[PDB]
């Protein structure tokens, strides 16, 4: 169908936009003097880089499922999504500690929370890919059900990161400080939309696609649609409002 030419365009424009916003963030690193909201900026740079990685990875699902592209998908998908949600979790934890009235974390500490929370997913993904490509049969003799089950089960730590970020961002809603509540509100909205999208495509891939007798014709389309849509949610519900808030300061 036309999903190979629409989504690719929706990828390509995204690849443009997440660069420009990246530039629109870097210049702000020369102009923001708050010492409390500046500490999140390297983490948001890493988040923008991970969104760019997601938009680039969408081509791996647009291009035919190959013995070359399957390790690329099975490694990069969970790793980049865990990087995004770990950056969101670090920002939400900084907001939790800021709304309560405590001194904000340094940017190095927030970057350590952003990177170290995504290292477990990196270890899991590299172990799975190395074991399949070395000890296994190089994805060759796997049924569509086996591949879908492995792809879903490989994302359990990412789902745990989603739930943890949801609860931590919800914890920002109470406290004596009110000017940090809007950042946590944006994070909460983004995580809720991401959770809804993830529930939708997991239910469609595991159960919806065999129900409509469209397996495995709809697997790569629903995963690519979910990838592009959630990357656009990351761009539009979190990054752009953060840019708007940081610009008027």
């Amino acid at each position, epitope marked *: 169908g036309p999903w190979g030419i629409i989504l690719e365009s929706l990828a390509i424009l995204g690849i443009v936009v997440t660069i420009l916003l990246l530039l629109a963030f870097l210049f702000l690193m020369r102009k923001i003097q708050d010492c409390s909201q500046w500490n999140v900026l390297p983490t948001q740079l890493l988040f923008l880089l991970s969104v760019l990685g997601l938009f680039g990875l969408a081509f791996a699902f647009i291009i035919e499922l*190959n*013995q*070359q592209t399957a390790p690329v998908r099975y490694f990069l998908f969970g790793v980049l999504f865990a990087l995004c949600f770990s950056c969101l979790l670090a920002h939400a934890s900084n907001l939790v500690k800021l709304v309560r009235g405590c001194v904000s974390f340094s940017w190095t500490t927030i970057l350590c929370i952003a990177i170290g929370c995504s290292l477990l997913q990196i270890i899991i993904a590299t172990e799975y890919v190395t074991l399949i490509m070395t000890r296994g049969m*190089m994805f*060759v*003799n796997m*049924t*569509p059900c086996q*591949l879908n089950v492995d792809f879903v089960v490989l994302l359990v730590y990412v789902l745990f990161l989603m739930a943890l970020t949801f609860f931590v961002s919800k914890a920002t809603f109470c406290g004596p400080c009110e000017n940090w509540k809007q950042h946590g509100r944006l994070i909460f909205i983004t995580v809720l939309f991401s959770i809804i999208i993830w529930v939708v495509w997991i239910s469609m891939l595991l159960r919806g696609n065999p129900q409509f007798q469209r*397996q495995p014709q709809w697997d790569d389309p629903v995963v690519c649609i979910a990838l592009v849509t959630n990357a656009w949610v990351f761009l539009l519900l979190y990054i752009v409002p953060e840019l708007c808030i940081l610009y008027r300061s």
Partner: antibody
Amino acid sequence: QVQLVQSGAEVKKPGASVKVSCKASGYSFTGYTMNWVRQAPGQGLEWMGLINPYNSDTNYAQKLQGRVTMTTDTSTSTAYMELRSLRSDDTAVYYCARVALRVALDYWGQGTLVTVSS
Amino acid sequence: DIQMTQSPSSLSASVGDRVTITCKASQNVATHVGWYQQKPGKAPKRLIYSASYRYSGVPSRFSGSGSGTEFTLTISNLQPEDFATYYCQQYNRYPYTFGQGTKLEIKR
């Protein structure tokens, strides 16, 4: 779209070696494993081995090890199969079959007849 | 290796009849069974992969079913171009093994 074209039928002697080629077109040749399957006249299909064109890793059948050699050429995208020390029971039609993911042997060559007789 | 036995070796039927070919595996091969159709003088043609899925361009008359060590290919509405030799193949583990082949013949 996807096409696998082999060489012509060949007649050999029962002490020689045979090379069967398989030109692949219409797809990325590097990212798909190639099997070789032979069929005796009047008999069923018999699997011989595989080669991965990405790293030239081969896997042969137990009864054929020691005389079968599978190579690939990425520049021309052609898979070659060599059979040495031919016997009268090696007279068969040979097929190159491509393996894609989630599926089974979906694309086949037209078949090359090797006739081994003195 | 895994022995893959077909039943029957040859059966006769007419146009419009429904036929069933049974394939039995010595070991548990899950659902990693394909079905192929071969005409005299031509290469085998894909019919079924994963023991229940049809390739693109395969008519809906062919239907695969079964699991474990018991698999079944069913042709509902027989056609003159459907009379050929049918093979069941397993790809659960190497080496690949085929069936002996079931020849489909016109009954009169």
